[PDB]
Design a protein around this ligand. Sequence first.
Ligand SMILES: Cc1cnccc1CN1C[C@@H](c2cc(F)c(F)c(F)c2)CC1=O
Length: 430
Amino acid sequence: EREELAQQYEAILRECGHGRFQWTLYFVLGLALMADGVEVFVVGFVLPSGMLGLIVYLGMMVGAFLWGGLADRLGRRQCLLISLSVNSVFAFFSSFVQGYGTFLFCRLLSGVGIGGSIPIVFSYFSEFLAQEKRGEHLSWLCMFWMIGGVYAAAMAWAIIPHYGWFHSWRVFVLVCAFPSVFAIGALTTQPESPRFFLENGKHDEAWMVLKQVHDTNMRAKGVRALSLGGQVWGNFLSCFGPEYRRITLMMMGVWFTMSFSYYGLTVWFPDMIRHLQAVDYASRTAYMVYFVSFLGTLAVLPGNIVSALLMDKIGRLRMLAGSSVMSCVSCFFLSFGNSESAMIALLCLFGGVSIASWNALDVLTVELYPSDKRTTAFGFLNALCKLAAVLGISIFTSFVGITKAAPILFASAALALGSSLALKLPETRG
Ligand SMILES: Cc1cnccc1CN1C[C@@H](c2cc(F)c(F)c(F)c2)CC1=O
């Protein structure tokens, strides 16, 4: 059977243990994750300055789907390189645009290019880990997304603290697209994931890559489209086979509900705080939007740190359930606070409580699936997560003049479903 390879692969990985290659690559892929976070922030609160920016999320959905499909048929480095090239190129041309009609098209294309940055990055770094510290390392890697969000927020506040409606978004977009260019430049000098080569049958190339990794670690101590179009459906439609069906549906449900809840709440908080400030002003009778939720992303890092060292001591399923429950209880408790500083503190707490669940999610998604679908399934789940994000943003933007209890209960129900499904997932023996 085409299954008795992971044993020898992990025996080799544990024999080499951990060294400096898994730190160099850690940072190289963290750069791409940082660029993805920068893009997500730019599309979230900076772009709508007319909340039609969800077309960018749709573009990122299509991108994540396509890149997840193509990653295992083109490798985890060629696909990542192409995705980051498309992103950087289009997000750099977005600064020489002439208005909105073409600017939003360029941003949509950049989103399509950068959608396949979380799935490929996480799978690629998962195929270089010893599996006894896999969860902790992946959780640490996740922090670069928050670093990217913080970087984008700081640059946006320092450069463009105003509303679009001589040139501001041009220089701002250059600064925001710098990280993707740096990620490409740093990633040009990495080897394609060895497990991909082993699955392709080119065991010689996989052995060469593994030997190069060992050398790096030892320093211390036309018709082609048809073939590549029907073959990606092999990875996807097989992800609904008898073996991986219940796992995949539960995974889809967890991703959908929890991403929807998080994105809805993160768009809600700045709006509700702004409305409260407006009410305070009436009581007398965007320079702060990049401070709000920027402090949230800064206060999330403690949660990620607490969810990284304990990611393996407790388990990759307990952690998930016990973080989803806490996230749901925090969403319920959000209504308790009715101020500005209190609301900011509650937002920071909720972010720090949900980041642990997110990290457990990303560890479990890459652990469950085999080498063949480790990226196709992850890309599909990320596309569904972005669909849920679009739905959450659209729903939560509507709730302005409606009582906060409605969004509170909506997010609480979504997180309750997420927690139930996560607790209902299979064990870690997969
Ligand atoms: C790393 C990652 C892995 N897989 C899929 C997506 C991602 C990227 N993130 C981060 C998540 C997040 C949730 C929070 F509640 C926070 F407070 C926070 F700061 C960040 C939301 C998301 O989509």
